[PDB]
Amino acid sequence: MSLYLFMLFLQPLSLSFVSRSFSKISSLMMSFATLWSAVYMWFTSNGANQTFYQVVSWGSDWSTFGVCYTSLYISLLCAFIFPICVILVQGYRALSILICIQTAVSLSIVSLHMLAFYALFESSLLLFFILIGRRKYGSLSAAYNISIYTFISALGFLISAFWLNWSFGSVCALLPNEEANSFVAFGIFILLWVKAPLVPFHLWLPEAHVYAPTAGSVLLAGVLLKISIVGLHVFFLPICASSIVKAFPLILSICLGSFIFSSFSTLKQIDLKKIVAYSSISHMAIVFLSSATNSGLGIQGAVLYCIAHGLISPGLFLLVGILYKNTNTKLVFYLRGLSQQAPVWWSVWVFFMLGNLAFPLFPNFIAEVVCLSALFKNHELYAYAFIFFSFVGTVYSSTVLGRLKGGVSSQCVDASRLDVISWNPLVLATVVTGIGYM
């Protein structure tokens, strides 16, 4: 734990002292060192400590950090996926912004103080405004959307944290507190409602992903959406369980509506990135509902599905980025003959799309099975609703694949050595998780 936190603080620090020409090499080595430190944290985490594997405090309640099941999986996912983002990004400015965003996100996951959690997650607010609104390839609209949505949700969460700190006297997760207040529950909930895109607060995500760089999109879908599940498991369910049980019919309505409307909206998309973004929104609904059931099957299923998404969505966003670099287009209508012209890109694309559809040899299948079982534990109709509407994902994915698969094309647009190197870890991880090493 201490090694992981130290490496996390060293990665932004290293950039200040690098030669400005060695920046990319140093950043890659630091990312790998952070991954190795995360593996060490996993090694030093004994299952015998059932509640929290490790807790460290550095002199205050704010500096209380600790790892649990959700935290451990998300932290390992962030450390696994960061090297890919690093190699995909060029320039000191871009590296600095990305490394600061990563440090803030990775510190947020392990934080056990609500106020510290807020301080670390929302520090990366201007950096995303600047990243999504970059000079030539960025959109100011998307930056404004994401920034305003984040500020409003996090401010509500902050108000709830202030009330809990005033009333109980502490806001640390390790101190058992329960609250029946509905205003405070709503304040904590609104952050989760926005961060994990749920209809009608999902509009910020697609704009940000489309106008973000591939490293940014990969980080966003891979781990930024997951930060909601850490807040739910660590900062919402322990204190506001009563309000989740009181509002379960409403929670279920909003989650199922998000899943349905997002699936239908994905059908009208002509941009590959927008298709992947709306697929993520649809997938987040099952995770949110499963965790809200407050059952063992649901919490485990939600975390597992989150890992599966955090392994499948970065792959699709990476392949889309590679294709866009080769062709300078994201319109499905312009891209044809990709099967014949890019047999190697096509194979990986088909594999990842099969993963997104929750086929058996993919992590998504196991995760979905567990989440559906949790819903069936609640009610049979709850499970049936989700299972039936899954066909809509098939229709859009099939239509996209069919449009891309065949036609006439005069351009050989296949992946280079660098592109295969970038996806190989993701492919291997997907396969390993698919075979049951979740």
Ligand X SMILES: CCCCCCCCCCCCCCCCCC(=O)OC[C@H](COP(=O)([O-])OCC(O)COP(=O)([O-])OC[C@@H](COC(=O)CCCCCCCCCCCCCCCCC)OC(=O)CCCCCCCCCCCCCCCCC)OC(=O)CCCCCCCCCCCCCCCCC
CB of 91 to another protein, least distance (A): 31
**Rounded Cα–Cα distance for residues 304 and 367 (Å):** 5
Cα 222 from Cα 77, distance rounded (Å): 8
Stretch that binds ligand PC7, among 60-68, 74-82, 157-165, 347-355 (CB under 6 A): 347-355
- Which is closer to ligand X, CB of 93 or CB of 379? 93
161 binds ligand PTY (CB under 6 A): no
Joined tokens for residue 258: 């998000």
CB nearer ligand PC7, residue 201 or residue 362 = 362
- β-strands 54-57, 64-67: how paired? antiparallel
The C-alpha angle with vertex 270 and arms to 263 and 398, in degrees rounded to 5, equals 60
- Binding to ligand PTY (CB under 6 A) within 78-97 occurs at 80
User: Tokens for 42?
Assistant: 């996993």
Residues 221, 307: Cα–Cα separation, whole Å = 11
CB of 424 to ligand PTY, least distance (A): 12
Cα dihedral sign, 105-110-111-112: positive
Rounded to the nearest angstrom, the gap between the alpha carbon of residue 344 and the centroid of all alpha carbons in its chain is: 27
3-state helix, strand, coil in the chain (%, to 5): 75, 5, 25
Q: Which residue's CB is nearer to ligand PC7, number 421 or number 435?
A: 435
126 binds, among ligand PC7, ligand PTY, ligand X, none (CB under 5 to 8 A by kind): ligand X
Q: Of 194, 221, 198, which Cα lies nearest the Cα of 310? A: 221
Verify binding: residue 300, ligand PC7, rule CB under 6 A: no
Binding site residues, ligand PTY, CB under 6 A = 42, 69, 72-73, 76-77, 80, 141, 144-145, 148-149, 152, 156, 159-160, 163, 182-187, 189-190, 201, 243, 247, 250-251, 254, 307, 429, 432-433, 437-438
Binding site residues, ligand X, CB under 6 A = 12-13, 15-16, 92-93, 96-97, 100, 103-104, 119-120, 123, 126-127, 130, 199-200
Binding site residues, ligand PC7, CB under 6 A = 339, 346-347, 350-351, 354, 359-361, 395, 399, 405, 435-437
